[PDB]
Amino acid sequence: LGGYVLGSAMSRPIIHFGSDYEDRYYRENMHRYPNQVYYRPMDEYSNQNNFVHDCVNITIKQHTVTTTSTETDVKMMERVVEQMCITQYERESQAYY
Amino acid sequence: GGYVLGSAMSRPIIHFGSDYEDRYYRENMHRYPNQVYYRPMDEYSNQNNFVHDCVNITIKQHTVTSTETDVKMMERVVEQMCITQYERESQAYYQ
């Protein structure tokens, strides 16, 4: 809780699954998940653990509100958001110090 | 085949959107494997096909060798280890 900011677009990561169905589904459908994440702006209480934790949590919540679907899409959304939040951390911390 | 087994590595930190899953991993991460199988780096490798192959072969090896929760967790762990292995291998390969 504390104010989040919507980050700039980034290229969507390719997420890999051991199941052939899901692996292909992601390749074909990745263009439909967001390519931006909401995050808590970096300050003295921030570290990589809580930055990504907070980012994944709020981004997933906001996407539910914004979308006003399937089990498969939920699973994949969460994985792409985590990878994007890690990128966002690298962006915000290589700009903080 | 043409795969190798990697050295054991620190288990990855992974965050989940569900509070339950997020805590389950925290508490049960030590019971997923801490090494992956992968296609060793050569002039055809890049991050995408390396991770693709490593996830495919490692998951297949552990299927041959679960709750829905553990299967999800396992895949996330393997993918992060595969990404870390790529970083290690490509750094060495370009020397």
> Which residues does chain B have within 8 Å of residue A16's beta carbon, measured at their own beta carbons?
51-52, 55-56, 79, 82
Query: Taking an 8 Å Cβ-Cβ cutoff, which residues of chain B contact chain A?
Result: 13-17, 22, 48, 51-52, 55-56, 58-60, 63, 72, 75-76, 78-79, 82
CB B41, CB B90: distance < 8 Å? yes
> Could you list the residue range(s) of the whole structural domain that residue B74 is in?
1-95
Looking up residue B10, the CATH number of its domain turns out to be 1.10.790.10
CB A27, CB A13: distance < 8 Å? no
> Which residues does chain A have within 8 Å of residue B14's beta carbon, measured at their own beta carbons?
82
Query: What sections of chain B are H helices per DSSP?
Result: 19-28, 47-64, 68-94
For residue A40, the cross-strand partners are none
CB A40, CB A54: distance < 8 Å? yes
- Residue A12 corresponds to which tokens in the numbers above? 């969507």
For residue A39, the cross-strand partners are A5
**Smallest Cβ distance to A16: which of B13, B14, B79?**
B79
Split into its structural domains, chain B has a count of 1
Method: X-ray
- Measured at the CA of B59, the angle between CA B55 and CA B63, to 5 degrees, comes to 170
**Smallest Cβ distance to A57: which of B17, B58, B82?**
B17
Of the candidates A75, A87, A71, A79, the one whose C-alpha atom is nearest the C-alpha of residue A36 is A87
> Which residues does chain B have within 8 Å of residue A61's beta carbon, measured at their own beta carbons?
17
